[PDB]
Assembly symmetry: D2
Homo-oligomer: 327 residues x 4
């Protein structure tokens, strides 16, 4: 059987605005267009909010799921992208901060489930893009950063274990993401995340392997193959993302399709998500995007360059072509 | 005949301090150690200085070459790494700024020659790491950045042509480097540099292809092969650098050796440089280096992790292994 | 004595081409006139160099709209600043020439609004603290050495601007601004030294009380500086502003010591300059204070509104001036 | 009246364990004593929480070295600040407890130096302007709302510190600091409001003239505030500093209006606080002014040296105090 191919909503946005009724229409029109190219599911980033609004968020996303269902999209699956934040930091040295971070992550597990989702992924250990500094604002890197991170990882392990026990009841697999040093202080490599997981009893807490992050920071195809086989053995290879090194066009890139996908397809039968970060205001600065935007039909004025749908269609075509070569 | 393998001094420093007599001893001891691993040449970054000191710089680097010769290193070849700066910007809209940038680049061509070098490479078009901003300090990215860059490239083309005519007299090939969007606004891709070069008559002005930059921003092996063949046809493939995506250990990485080197070895017979950026103060922040430092014997205290020489030795071993596979 | 007020109570951009905003501008003027204000300081937002003729048309149309709304007698001064691009202190002649053309455009806009006084940081680009090529800051003695070259570069450009401004009947009032906002000129002593190399007396000084108090040399030295500027025919404008740039009626502005030497020699307008906590200034001026809420733009609250503060500003200014005369 | 001077003329770190630096410290004290200074304000550089006992030993050894060099009678006050980590205003109890332990350590260090006055920004972390999780700045009304929670968090911690400081005979003088340097408390009115929720009168105020002038409500309101603090037994310390933090003898410090209400109720030391253009302050205070060069550290030049400025500072302070009394 041919695998399910999903696409990330980072082609359009970092905020689903589940309460904005006019925006829901835009979400549904994108999904219907994308489905015609063969996409069977979508990754929804869950924008962070205030802790007093957890119940209201759950209600809004429940209403978004119901609206998608009422539009004929019952069979469409959703995965979520969720990140720890400077405030909602489970690796904090302060117990109350960690507990507040756990409640934040439990809320996001609830939203994932309300969307019918069975996969919640992202940088849920160390806050995304929050490179640590001294009290006098001096950066902390290399050896000093690695010593600092040991304490953060020790702080977070029991919190992630508790979140795993909770997510298991909810039937949501937790897929922690190794992300490149260019974007976040850690975990950057699959070796660093594997080391973190040794202190988390719950197998509900596993990994997402994203090809862009693996190529930018990983240890090569031989070591990678051993890590893939280990994760599948442990029952911790929860999700897989295909994304080029520049995070843009998937069909013109140095993504090592054969070397990356061959070991994964042997042991993983879940969905493969196309994760393309469009040059939208949320990413131009954080990802240093010098490339032109894949203009979004109806939002952006048309131009002579490829549009968001052009790129999405070529992305699924290349992914299927390359998957077919491995079979 | 087996190709010459060079290594970059970015393993140790961004400043050769040609006038510091005690530092020369350190430079020579590194070179002698590295030669034992099989390295036949070295890339020396040329740190920028004040325009009033051009003549003094030429004299100092001439004295450095003579000191290397007096230490038995006559046969050791040097290439240089040189970058345009915010001040010394040949893409400026202001004629005097461009002329002052040309004199800066001519000085660096002179230093290259005084070091016996026949290759000067680097980000010599747009100032390295100087992402443009509005007068009100707002960043400029994506489509807007690409429109901005057309004017900068038009400003720089006649200046680079004049520098090529000068370098040809000096017997120094100029190798402009496509560098990842993570580090600089442009040129990021080999397609962008090829477009720039269409407006430069002088073939003395060509390219360096660095595998780390090609993988991070390039268009994949099929388009890359066409670009390699085009450059060699034009007589503009002046230099080649092997560097992993994370810029660290060359032997444990996703560098696509076969796909990257196969088209190059067919048409290029120059030196292949190992370019490893050690986690030294000059790079920890600019390259966001979360990895531990390859400690430098005698400078840094020893530790249990790999040292600078360990990494250098493994780098040449892997490069030769992979080159042998292509033959 | 005519008392004016800055539009920095509301904005940094007069949006002269925006027909809806013109009504807002007129509304604010009519309200502030009832408090006794006889003129207004309009900041001139910078733009693209291809649009100078259109800018002139837009501001001319704004002046004519004010006139048609019964505001013929309302006077206008302008606030203009050099920018990183439009820098007359640049080492590069074409950059200085482009800076000169920008400032000449702004002189034409001032004149088109009936203005006789264009003021601001027109020598060194406002808030552009210089850095090395490696983005390291330059301060103190190293900065002062760096500024000698910048000042030398700008002197001839300001003189040419002066000659042009004299023709258009617009006085140029260069502003010493605190070190907290800009690298220089920060003190009246630095500006005086700069002006020694400028022939055109059309290029003078604006004295802002907030900047004088923050960086100045005290009341004894200040008196002597004020007397000197009047002898040089270079005291072109005066602004009253408290140290925190907010409420003028509850501040440490040294009214007596600041106004006494000035009122002996100066009979131009005195401008109230209050920087409200609007988005253009909250970060740049580090404003921890609550906004003086703008009626019909901001929702009301228990704290003072923009008009409350503006009314108290003119009342205290009048009171203190009366104590001197 | 005893006149003290801050070591911010030279440093932010007394390096008490550094035997070579101790000689430098003693050298500076002996030189400044000849001008009439009877005491010194020592900033206490923060460190790691595992080193509190060693810090206490180092500063105790420094005090004993001064004593052995004939400086038994030299008095010392300390300058201490909360930090992003050691924040008593944190929402997290363990963070507040760790902040409390840091401040208690610093009370022990003050006492070990013979100090009776520990002062500074010990409520909200100095210069740590709060941001959203996306690194967006928080200013004005939104910041003031944010500070209500921070202040509420800190009140009980400062009260416990007060109880501890009373035992050790060290008065705690919290400092209103300008909005240019820190998010709060910026004004004496904000600090007064904070102190309403603190039971311990050992926790009081330092009034710094530079901060009062930059952010304060003027001489009429200030008099009333000074009278109130004296009635509350909370005016623990006074510092004289010009607005630009440099030369005290050529500035807009309003000597009469600032000192008159204070001298009626306060008879503690008056500290000259000059922040020299040293690397610790050039960027943080945006110092465009030339350094007051430090003899034997900096090469000489034609401009005033650190001692020249310090001598003129005490002379003007004495002169102005004499004008009042
Ligand atoms: O690499 C991207 C990350 O997934 C981040 O943007 C949201 O978690
Ligand atoms: O990618 C690195 C560049 O070569 C720069 O550091 C010097 O030019
Ligand atoms: O002191 C303020 C300045 O004048 C600036 O904001 C406009 O020029
Ligand atoms: O106003 C200055 C502050 O007190 C700070 O630098 C030391 O606490
Ligand atoms: Cl906990
Ligand atoms: Cl806690
Ligand atoms: Cl966005
Ligand atoms: Cl030119
Ligand atoms: Cl020019
Ligand atoms: Cl370095
Ligand atoms: Cl010129
Ligand atoms: Cl605004
Ligand atoms: Cl507590
Ligand atoms: Cl210092
Ligand atoms: Zn991803
Ligand atoms: Zn390179
Ligand atoms: Zn002003
Ligand atoms: Zn102080």
């Amino acid at each position: 059987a041919t695998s399910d191919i999903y696409i990330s909503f980072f082609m359009f946005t970092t905020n689903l605005q589940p309460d904005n009724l006019d925006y829901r229409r835009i979400v549904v029109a994108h999904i219907k267009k994308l489905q015609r190219f063969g996409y069977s599911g979508f990754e929804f980033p869950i924008a962070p909010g205030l802790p007093e609004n957890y119940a209201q968020d759950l209600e809004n996303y429940t209403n978004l799921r119901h609206y998608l269902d009422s539009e004929g999209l019952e069979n469409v699956k959703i995965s979520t992208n969720v990140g720890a934040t400077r405030t909602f930091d489970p690796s904090s040295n302060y117990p109350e901060q960690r507990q507040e971070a756990l409640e934040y992550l439990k809320s996001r597990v609830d939203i994932t489930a309300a969307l019918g989702g069975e996969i919640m992924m992202g940088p849920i250990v160390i806050p995304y893009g929050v490179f640590p500094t001294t009290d006098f604002n001096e950066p902390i890197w290399s050896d000093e950063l690695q010593e600092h991170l040991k304490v953060r990882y020790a702080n977070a392990q029991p919190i992630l274990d508790k979140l795993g026990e909770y997510a298991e009841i909810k039937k949501v697999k937790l897929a922690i993401e190794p992300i490149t040093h260019w974007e976040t202080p850690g975990p950057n490599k699959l070796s660093q995340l594997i080391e973190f997981l040794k202190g988390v009893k719950s197998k509900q807490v596993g990994v997402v392997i994203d090809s862009a992050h693996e190529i930018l920071d990983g240890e090569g195809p031989e070591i990678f193959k051993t890590q893939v086989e280990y994760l599948a053995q442990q029952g911790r290879l929860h999700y897989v993302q295909v994304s080029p090194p520049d995070r843009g066009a998937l069909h013109t890139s140095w993504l090592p399709w054969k070397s990356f996908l061959t070991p994964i397809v042997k042991v993983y039968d879940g969905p493969i998500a196309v994760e393309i970060f469009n040059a939208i205001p949320a990413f131009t600065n954080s990802l240093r995007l010098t490339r032109r935007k894949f203009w979004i039909p109806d939002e952006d004025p048309p131009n002579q360059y490829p549009n968001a749908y052009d790129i999405a269609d070529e992305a699924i075509k290349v992914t299927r072509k390359e998957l077919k070569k491995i079979g």
